[PDB]
C-alpha cells in the first residue's frame, strides 16, 4: 500500500480513538505502537474486553486485512466502534502506514 494514503485514512478513521507513536497515550482505544507481531490484547496498560484479550491471533498484515474489513465479525464482543473498510486497496494503504508508524 501507499503510506501517505494510509496516513490520511488513519487520521480520518482511527486517530479519534488511537495513537500510534511510541509512548502515546491510550485514548478510547489502545495505543497501537508495537502491534505488529503481537498477540491480541497486549498494549501495556490498556483494559481490553475479554473478547479481544482472548481472540488469540497474532497481528500482522493478513489478520489486520481481515479485522479491518469488519471488526465485530472478527472479534465478536469487541468494544471498538468501527463498521469496517470495504475496499481492499484502502485497507492495504492503511496497513502499510501502520506498519511504519507503529514501529518508528
Residues that bind ligand HEC (CB under 6 A): 13-14, 16-18, 28-30, 35, 40-43, 48-49, 51-52, 68, 78-82
33 in a known ligand binding site: no
Using the minimum distance from each CB to ligand HEC, give the nearer residue, 40 or 96: 40
17 in a known ligand binding site: yes
Residue nearest to ligand HEC (CB): 29
Q: Closest approach of Cβ 104 to ligand HEC, in Å?
A: 16
DSSP conformation letters of the chain: --HHHHHHHIIIIITTT---STTPPP-SS---TT-TT-BTT-STT----HHHHH---B-SHHHHHHHHH-HHHHSTT----------HHHHHHHHHHHHHHTT-
Q: Closest approach of Cβ 27 to ligand HEC, in Å?
A: 8
26 in a known ligand binding site: no
Whole-angstrom distance, CA of residue 56 vs CA of residue 70: 17
Using the minimum distance from each CB to ligand HEC, give the nearer residue, 1 or 41: 41
| Known binding positions for heme c | 14, 17-18, 80
Amino acid at each position: 500500500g501507499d503510506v501517505e494514503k494510509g496516513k490520511k485514512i488513519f487520521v480520518q478513521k482511527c486517530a479519534q480513538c488511537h495513537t500510534v507513536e511510541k509512548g502515546g497515550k491510550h485514548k478510547t482505544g489502545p495505543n497501537l505502537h508495537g502491534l505488529f507481531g503481537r498477540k491480541t490484547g497486549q498494549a501495556p496498560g490498556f483494559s481490553y474486553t475479554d473478547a479481544n484479550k482472548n481472540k488469540g491471533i497474532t497481528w500482522g498484515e493478513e489478520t489486520l486485512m481481515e479485522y479491518l474489513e469488519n471488526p465485530k465479525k472478527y472479534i465478536p464482543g469487541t468494544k471498538m466502534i468501527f463498521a469496517g473498510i470495504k475496499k481492499k486497496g484502502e485497507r492495504e494503504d492503511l496497513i502499510a502506514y501502520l506498519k511504519k508508524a507503529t514501529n518508528e
